Amino acid sequence: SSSVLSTSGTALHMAAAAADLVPNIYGFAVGGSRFGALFNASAIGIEIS
Amino acid sequence: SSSVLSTSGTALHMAAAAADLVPNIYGFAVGGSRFGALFNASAIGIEISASATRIAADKISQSEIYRRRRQEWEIQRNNAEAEIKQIDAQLATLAVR
Amino acid sequence: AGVSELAYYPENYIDPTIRIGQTGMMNNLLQQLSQSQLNIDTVEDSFKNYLTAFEDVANLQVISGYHDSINVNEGLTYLIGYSQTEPRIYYWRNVDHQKCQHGQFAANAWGEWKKIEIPINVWQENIRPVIYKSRLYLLWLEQKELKNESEDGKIDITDYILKLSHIRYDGSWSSPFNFNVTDKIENLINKKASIGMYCSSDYEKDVIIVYFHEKKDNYSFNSLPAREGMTINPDMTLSILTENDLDAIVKSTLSELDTRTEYKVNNQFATDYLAEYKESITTKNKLASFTGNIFDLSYISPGNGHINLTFNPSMEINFDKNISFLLKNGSDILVELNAEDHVASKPSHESDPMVYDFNQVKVDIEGYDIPLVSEFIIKQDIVIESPIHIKLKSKDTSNVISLHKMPSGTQYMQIGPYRTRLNTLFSRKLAERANIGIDNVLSMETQNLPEPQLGEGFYATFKLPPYNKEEHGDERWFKIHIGNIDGNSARQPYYEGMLSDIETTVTLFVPYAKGYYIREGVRLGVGYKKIIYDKSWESAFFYFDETKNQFIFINDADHDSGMTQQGIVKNIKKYKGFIHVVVMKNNTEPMDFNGANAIYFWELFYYTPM
Amino acid sequence: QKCQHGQFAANAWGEWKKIEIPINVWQENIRPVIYKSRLYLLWLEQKELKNESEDGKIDITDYILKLSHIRYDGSWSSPFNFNVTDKIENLINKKAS
Amino acid sequence: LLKNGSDILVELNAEDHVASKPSHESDPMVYDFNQVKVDIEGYDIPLV
């Protein structure tokens, strides 16, 4: 159960990374979105694998 | 205690994620709130759940190795009891001799 | 012998440790208690950790549902509930309508609540399930409000996003699929309107339908609500849907729309009819496979209950006064076709497959369940049976699942007259039992704690005469029917029981929602194999007096000039068929171990001590 | 009940128990309450965000009431948020503590 | 019959001052005596 349930969080790290690529800030400051979010999620996915 | 106390932080990761969805910045910059906070907290919750069931497996495995240790001790105790009865009966046949 | 002994003596094969269908909290207690050393403190901490999870599942609360069928009483419903947290966690369960034999579910019908792994932040409880290709999809809206609250450079950005996620075979949930839908929701917000959400699955077209509408108090089929819509393919691309298709697709399901005061459950989408048929059907004879088939089936409903079929039948024999086509109803041969007559392009013997292609078959059938049988007669004796079952979607409000929440906290699902409890309020009583001691939660008094009565309602005990083959008939049963509920004021099958010896009684809950009780109030008469009752005050007539705020049984005496919900009627007879009909005045119905949450109460009070 | 005449025994006193939930009280407005024999815990938090400027001076205060209760396993619920800044700003616009 | 420590404050009968006496065809016999008003003074009131 641990070995199966461990793998079921990497696509949800992917969802976190895809959600954090759109720019948060709006207005006179145009937008701040972290750019290495997908690489960080793919790295933590290969760690959890 | 480790396996139980490990699971009691996932709802508080949830609280961290729900707190970090409201926009921090105000004024002429309208607001910055991280959007994958709930997904990050649900992911770290499923990680800490997997760690808790690993350590529950280690708990039960150590309990089972203690039970098998006691069973092998029972084997050795029965061997020693049989051998001391055998030596007593050999003392009997030596008294007859 | 093991199987037959397990049938006759299940006691020999039950262990308290493993069980087919035990919940996750039961397994978690088993994990937490699987040691060599079990103190009293260890087992009490394990039981309190169990009670925490039992409390978390006991405090669930249904937002929305989806019924997987055309007819309500046939398929099985998917409910979505949430927990009492600010990071609100959503759950889904399943309930089967084939298992309820007459109005009331068994506990075999209900599925376990299952936590969904995906974190979901719904805007204004617009979260709907939908079954598409036998797969549970889950649709919800999210908003992104970013407001400046200023004068110099005032900035107000709202972003409405529709998210789609579905379940996998391993219990996991898909990463959510994003749809920017802020144009349509802002077009409905610029009009002064609260926004509803329709989500269902069309099966004829292979798409799923999401339109957003304004919430009126009623939908009147001439004034359609303000609506902007969308449909999305099995590949998760978005399909545009024109306003003519949108008008037809809203007129087809106005009866399933969430109004301002009543929450509905969407059914499977069907405009008029859905046909259950297979195209190609083979036989595989030792001489030749005949493989007769129906190619292009299309149907048009011209009125209320009529249908106009159109299809092209053929048979594809690969190695006259012979082979024929013939379509039957129950006994009516509607279209009979021959191969020698009225067939263009009869195939040659140089073909190994012989395709015949009879003609275009038009036929006009009336009814709602149409079990057609298309036959490919080959004889001289080989019949290829191709059934076509054509079912109508009844647009009545009796074909709509409504769900209600009382201010007492109880929450029920209502199909027609029948109400089914969805929630439990045991957790609101549990803390007083649990902080006293572990002995006090497993008491019988904890099991005998009362619950609310599922709506306004009242109870009535009906005492019944003995069976003696006269005044009853032959087959020894009673059907306590009901009348005056909807605009339908007729004999509806409310309750059925087997008639018994000298004395038998039954207490029935009778609903009320201030819109029911069309004329004279609800009547409740007896059915039998012999002549049924309810002929001009033979039935048991009730109403709700708004002044005294209680329910009044009209019949009891031979009352003259008595009060009814309309006004004073002159001559009121006694009920016939029963002996004694009396309002029960705050009945209890304690906790229902055969209910929706029955597996959790059985696990709490039997399986966990075992 | 343990104090028989004005003075408690040491049997009356319970152990201090750490609450797991992190709490940032505004001006010591934190109160416990027992509801249905369950320990709820109520406190206020504020969110001061001040510009300190003349061109576009921005002064936002957000007063939030949070509710958390204890579970049977000693854990604490994730806190339940209540936006209460209208009422506290109506009491702050009057010169009052 | 409702008592204080020794004061019978309200005594009620089933034959007297009871509307809708139930019939024997009912298996539960609900009596519903009347509305009981009473004026008591004190701070601890152990009524029976």
Question: Resolution, in Å, please?
Answer: 2.8
C455, C406 Cβ separation under 8 angstroms: yes
Q: Return d(Cα C69, Cα C65) in angstroms, integer.
A: 12
Q: CB C52 to CB D37 under 8 A?
A: no
Task: Estimate the share of chain D in helix, then strand, then coil, as percent rounded to the nearest 5.
Answer: 10, 35, 55
DSSP C256: G
Q: Return d(Cα C211, Cα C226) in angstroms, integer.
A: 10
For C535-575, the DSSP string reads SSS-S-BEEEETTTTEEEE--TTT-EEEE-SSSEEEE-PPP
C462, C494 Cβ separation under 8 angstroms: no
Q: CB D79 to CB C87 under 8 A?
A: no
Q: Which residues contact C173 (CB under 8 A, 6 or more apart)?
A: C116, C117, C118, C138, C165, C166, C167
Residues in chain B within 8 Å Cβ distance of C89: 14
Using alpha carbons, select from C363, C242, C216, C258 the residue that is nearest to residue C302. Answer: C363
SS3 letters across C60-95: CEEEEEEECCCCCCCCEEEEEEECCCCCCCEEEEEE
Q: Is E48 helix (H, G, I), strand (E, B) or coil?
A: coil
Q: Is C242 helix (H, G, I), strand (E, B) or coil?
A: coil
Is C55 an 8 Å CB contact of chain D?
Answer: yes
Residues in chain D within 8 Å Cβ distance of B26: 49, 58, 60
Count residue pairs from B and C with Cβ separation < 8 A: 55
Using alpha carbons, select from C269, C231, C233, C230 the residue that is nearest to residue C252. Answer: C269
Q: Return d(Cα C302, Cα C477) in angstroms, integer.
A: 42
Whose tokens are 């420590």? That residue is E5
C135, C124 Cβ separation under 8 angstroms: no
Residue of chain C whose alpha carbon sits nearest to that of D78: C85
C511, C417 Cβ separation under 8 angstroms: yes
Q: CB B27 to CB C119 under 8 A?
A: no
C232, C239 Cβ separation under 8 angstroms: yes
Residues in chain D within 8 Å Cβ distance of C152: 56
Backbone φ and ψ for C284, nearest 5 degrees, come out as 60, 65
Residue length of chain B: 97
Q: Which residue among C118, C153, C170 places its CB closest to the CB of A27?
A: C153
Q: CB C505 to CB E27 under 8 A?
A: yes
Using alpha carbons, select from C289, C441, C475, C484 the residue that is nearest to residue C378. Answer: C289
Per DSSP (E only), the strands in C10-134 are 61-67, 76-82, 90-96, 114-115, 127-132
- Tokens at C244, concatenated: 């003519």
C605, C448 Cβ separation under 8 angstroms: no
Q: Return d(Cα D46, Cα D65) in angstroms, integer.
A: 9
Q: Return d(Cα C437, Cα C431) in angstroms, integer.
A: 10
E: neighbours with 3+ CB pairs under 8 Å?
A: C
Q: Return d(Cα C421, Cα C402) in angstroms, integer.
A: 12
A: neighbours with 3+ CB pairs under 8 Å?
A: B, C
Q: Strands across the sheet with C273-277, in order?
A: C273-277, C383-392, C369-377, C324-328, C333-338
Q: Return d(Cα C521, Cα C575) in angstroms, integer.
A: 14
Q: Return d(Cα C88, Cα C591) in angstroms, integer.
A: 27
Q: Which residues contact B20 (CB under 8 A, 6 or more apart)?
A: B33, B34, B37
Pairing between β-strand C504-510 and β-strand C411-415 as defined by DSSP bridges: unpaired
Q: Return d(Cα C418, Cα C398) in angstroms, integer.
A: 10
**Residue ranges in C173-220 assigned as alpha helix (H):** 182-190
Q: CB A14 to CB C155 under 8 A?
A: no
Q: Return d(Cα C108, Cα C106) in angstroms, integer.
A: 5
- Taking residue D52's Cβ as centre, other Cβ atoms within 10 Å add up to 7
DSSP C607: I
For C462-522, the DSSP string reads EEEPPP-SSSS-SS-EEEEEEBSSSS--S-EEEEEEE--SS-EEEEEEE---SS---SSS-
C126, C105 Cβ separation under 8 angstroms: no
Q: Which residues contact C261 (CB under 8 A, 6 or more apart)?
A: C217
Using alpha carbons, select from B46, B7, C167, B16 the residue that is nearest to residue A44. Answer: B46
Pairing between β-strand C135-147 and β-strand C156-166 as defined by DSSP bridges: antiparallel
Residue of chain B whose alpha carbon sits nearest to that of D61: B26
Q: Which residue among C117, C152, C153 places its CB closest to the CB of B42?
A: C117
Residue of chain D whose alpha carbon sits nearest to that of B7: D75
Is A49 an 8 Å CB contact of chain B?
Answer: no
Q: Is A46 helix (H, G, I), strand (E, B) or coil?
A: helix
Q: Return d(Cα C425, Cα E22) in angstroms, integer.
A: 33
Q: Return d(Cα C89, Cα C112) in angstroms, integer.
A: 16
Q: Return d(Cα C140, Cα C123) in angstroms, integer.
A: 8
C36, B66 Cβ separation under 8 angstroms: yes
